[PDB]
Design brief:
It is classed as isomerase. By secondary structure, the chain is mainly beta. It contains one helix and seven strands. It has one domain: Roll (Chitinase A, domain 3), CATH 3.10.50.40. The radius of gyration is 15 Å and the shape is globular. It starts with 8 loop residues before the first strand and ends in a 9-residue tail after the last strand.
Amino acid sequence: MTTEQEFEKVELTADGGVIKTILKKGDEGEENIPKKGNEVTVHYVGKLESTGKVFDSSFDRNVPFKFHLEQGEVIKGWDICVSSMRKNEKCLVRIESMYGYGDEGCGESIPGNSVLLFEIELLSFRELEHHHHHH
């Protein structure tokens, strides 16, 4: 009956140091692993934790925007989350200044070196073997 789940955060995971919170866990899937360099489809949404401001724009709550993993658009914040997701799993990731485009300044909703939360749910993915076959 928990409305506020007592979840732990993963602070600086070994995949390049990103903060993500475990919400749902992948039930089972050996082949069910979305990794970088491969094509994945996910939706992102949430709020600005930096001030607790919930998202309310004409675009974010309306348009289903999705990116692909490792297309150069994603740096680290999404990268660690999606490359460690599962098709039946879900985590909340923290987009910090260095985890996002706080360097270049190119953001979407409110990119001001603030910490934002995006719920990433990997509904579609496809592991493509693009490496030389040893055997």
